[PDB]
Amino acid sequence: VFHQFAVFCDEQLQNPDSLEDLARLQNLKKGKDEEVAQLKHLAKAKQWQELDQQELRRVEQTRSEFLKLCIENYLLSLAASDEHDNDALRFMALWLEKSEEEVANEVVKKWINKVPTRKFALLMNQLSSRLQDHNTLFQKLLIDLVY
Amino acid sequence: QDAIMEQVFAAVSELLKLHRETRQRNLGIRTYKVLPLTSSSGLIEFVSNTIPLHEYLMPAHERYYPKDLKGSQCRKEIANAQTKNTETRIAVYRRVTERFHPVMRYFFMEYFPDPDEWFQKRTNYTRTTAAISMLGHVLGLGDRHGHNILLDHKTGEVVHIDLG
Numbered sequence: 645v646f647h648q649f650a651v652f653c654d655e656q657l658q659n660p661d662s663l664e665d666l667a668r669l670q671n672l673k674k675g676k677d678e679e680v681a682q683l684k685h686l687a688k689a690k691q692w693q694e695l696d697q698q699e700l701r702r703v704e705q706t707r708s709e710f711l712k713l714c715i716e717n718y719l720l721s722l723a724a725s726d727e728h729d730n731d732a733l734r735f736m737a738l739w740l741e742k743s744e745e746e747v748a749n750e751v752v753k754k755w756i757n758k759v760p761t762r763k764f765a766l767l768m769n770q771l772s773s774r775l776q777d778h779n780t781l782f783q784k785l786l787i788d789l790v791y
Numbered sequence: 792q793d794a795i796m797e798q799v800f801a802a803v804s805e806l807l808k809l810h811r812e813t814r815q816r817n818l819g820i821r822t823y824k825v826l827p828l829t830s831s832s833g834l835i836e837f838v839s840n841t842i843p844l845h846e847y848l849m850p851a852h853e854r855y856y857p858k859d860l861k862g863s864q865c866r867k868e869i870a871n872a873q874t875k876n877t878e879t880r881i882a883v884y885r886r887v888t889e890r891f892h893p894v895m896r897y898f899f900m901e902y903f904p905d906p907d908e909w910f911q912k913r914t915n916y917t918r919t920t921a922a923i924s925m926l927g928h929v930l931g932l933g934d935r936h937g938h939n940i941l942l943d944h945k946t947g948e949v950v951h952i953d954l955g
């Protein structure tokens with residue numbers, strides 16, 4: 645069940661349609677902000693800009709929920725059975741891409757201590773290459789995992 | 792623009808004739824002729840015995856359902872909630888379409904009362920709609936409002952104009 649749900653959410657993130665939609669809304673925000681700066685008519689322009697901002701917030705919040713569910717369910721599927729063990733490689737890629745997004749790091753902090761470390765044992769070339777002393781949360785999780 | 796795109800659509804529909812399944816069903820599009828004279832004027836072929844989709848649908852909606860909203864009331868109600876959040880827009884749209892019922896099935900019961908002819912013409916409508924839907928998805932065709940779709944009330948089959 646957990647692998648099903650995690651693969652579903654992952655597939656929803658890396659969706660060509662959804663990425664095109666996010667790119668289109670981003671270019672719209674950029675162009676409308678450039679137009680508003682050109683002016684400073686202004687009232688309707690600002691109102692359209694604010695509506696674009698609200699649409700973009702909605703889209704980004706949807707993507708953030710998908711990311712939370714993806715990471716959490718990957719970690720729960722690794723801790724449950726041994727049928728799906730290349731979920732460790734996919735979780736690792738997905739987590740190293742989002743090392744700054746504090747959402748991902750909170751979910752990982754919550755669920756990382758229940759995975760047997762034998763799932764990550766063969767990924768020490770990739771883990772020990774990202775080690776640093778930066779006092780962030782990503783590093784406090786990564787160093788503890790390598791330890 | 793309209794002339795070039797009409798030519799492209801005609802060429803692709805000609806490609807459709809080379810395959811057994813689409814040729815067996817005569818899947819294709821209906822063409823018209825655009826002739827640009829200058830950069831500001833042209834001659835367009837007036838398709839013979841059609842009627843615009845909106846010009847059939849707006850009188851029929853009040854002829855068959857006299858208690859529903861008008862077309863203009865629905866348009867205005869949807870245009871007022873154009874600068875609002877998506878939740879309110881979808882709520883207004885559901886509220887409007889709960890008071891607006893489709894009437895297109897009558898276009899065939901009132902131009903073709905003979906069941907043999909009625910069945911053949913309704914199948915022509917469905918097939919030409921399917922062909923132009925796929926062909927206009929593949930080529931990104933847009934601006935498909937009611938005034939660019941004509942209903943041919945002799946053969947049943949839709950004609951798409953203004954393909955620019």
Ligand SMILES: Nc1ncnc2c1ncn2[C@@H]1O[C@H](COP(=O)(O)OP(=O)(O)OP(O)(O)=S)[C@@H](O)[C@H]1O
Nearest residue numbers: 823835836837838841843844937938939940941952
């Ligand atoms: N080539 C054509 N053959 C037959 N009917 C046509 C043709 N072109 C347009 N029409 C119809 O005749 C009318 C002419 O429409 P126009 O006023 O030229 O453009 P329009 O599409 O009505 O204006 P907008 O911008 O779409 S509101 C409309 O009701 C069309 O459905």
Ligand SMILES: [Mg+2]
Nearest residue numbers: 938939952953
């Ligand atoms: Mg037109």
